[PDB]
Amino acid sequence: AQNPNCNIMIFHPTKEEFNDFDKYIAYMESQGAHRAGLAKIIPPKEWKARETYDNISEILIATPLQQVASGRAGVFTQYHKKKKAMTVGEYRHLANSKKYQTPPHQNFEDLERKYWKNRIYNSPIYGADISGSLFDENTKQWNLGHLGTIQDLLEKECGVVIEGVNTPYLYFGMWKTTFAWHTEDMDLYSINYLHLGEPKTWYVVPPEHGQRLERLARELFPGSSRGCGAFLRHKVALISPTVLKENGIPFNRITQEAGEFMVTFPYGYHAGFNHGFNCAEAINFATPRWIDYGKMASQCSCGEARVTFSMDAFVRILQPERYDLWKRGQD
Ligand SMILES: O=C(O)CNC(=O)C(=O)O
Ligand SMILES: [Mg+2]
Ligand code: NI
Ligand SMILES: [Zn+2]
């Protein structure tokens, strides 16, 4: 069995290997990359996402989200308070202000220590989930707006044509902006490209151990767990690496830098934080190996998780027994 300790693997494809996206994902899986839940892909030196980032300041962040924490430093939830619209140039200036800027630090490990010590005492503002793309249309390799769609994959594998679309999303971050513990909708893959700026630190639980994280989360968030049998779908709970280690939960960590891709694999729980002002692009995707995970994915039906239009068909076709209850949660 390849990668039996479920370590995060880092890949350096050549320009020739960067042509065929599906083939390279399958290659990484042949080497055991999925067992970690997360892999890093460093593009060949010949590749670029676009020519420059000098002209992005006028993108609008219609609904910036202030991430307010509750709990203790290592075990907390966050809620998202909506703020007034602002441009990317306005948000960059805000991120660099004395109130929000990255503190002085020695290295990524020092900054990580500072994040976990102090995150709860601040409320950073995240420009998340903005439909759009920063890949140039002429970038032919690993262009996250030109991937095979999940609807087409389901149709290819299972024969059923379904409605829905699959487009990327932009994320503008600042110091301490946080992504809570989650797997993807319908336990899909995700791919995330860090276009510019400061790093993003990731934590991940191997897919084979995801239920250990779920059991800990039910213990640590007992009111939330009574409210919903899949409350991590709400994307609000944080647990620190120190608490995971105290409770014996297997996990790994890695820092993504500008110019790097990360892939999350089906049922790979992940969480993390941004080091400072940055911009990432991410999208969900599927392969043949995903279908069995999609069929088994948990679902939130309490009403909180509320998701995209295109999840309806995935539930309807892959999980017909759960469909009626899930759709009630959507309405
Ligand atoms: O970058 C973020 O805030 C969150 N990203 C992801 O969870 C992802 O790419 O799957
Ligand atoms: Mg612009
Ligand atoms: Ni994710
Ligand atoms: Zn729920």
Could you tell me the two tokens for 153? 């994959």
- Find the Cα–Cα–Cα–Cα dihedral 113, 115, 120, 123, rounded to 10°: 160
* Helix 150-158 vs helix 311-318: crossing angle, to nearest 10: 20
Annotated binding site for Fe cation: 182, 184, 270
Q: Find the CATH number of the domain harbouring 311.
A: 2.60.120.650
User: Is 313 touching ligand 1 by the criterion CB < 6 Å?
Assistant: no
What's the number of domains the chain is made of?
1
Nearest atom in ligand 1 to 179's CA:
3
Residue entry with tokens 């999980």: 319
Q: Give the residue whose CA is nearest to atom 7 of ligand 1.
A: 179
The DSSP symbol for 157 reads H
CA distance 309 to 236: 21
Token pair of 81 as six digits: 């308070």
- Closest by Cα among 224, 208, 206, 191 to 305: 224
- Ligand 1 atom with the smallest distance to the CA of 282 is 9
Is residue 319 within 8 Å of residue 168, measured between CB atoms? Answer: no
Alpha helices in the chain (DSSP H): 21-30, 88-95, 108-118, 150-158, 210-220, 222-227, 241-246, 290-296, 311-318, 320-330
Phi, psi at residue 54, to the nearest 5°?
Answer: -75, -10
Dmax over Cα atoms in the chain, in whole Å?
Answer: 55
Residue labelled with tokens 């087409």: 152
φ, ψ for residue 316 (rounded to 5)? -55, -40
Q: Supply 245's token pair.
A: 């280690």
Query: Strand pairing partners for 252?
Result: 204
What's the 197 CA to ligand 4 centre distance in angstroms?
34
Q: Which domain holds residue 28?
A: 1-331
Resolution for this model in angstroms, one decimal place?
1.3
Burial of 98 (0-12, 13-18, 19+ CB in 10 A): exposed
| Adjacent-strand bridge partners of 200 | 256, 274
- Cα of 197 to ligand 2 centre, how many Å? 16
- Eight-state DSSP code of residue 148: P
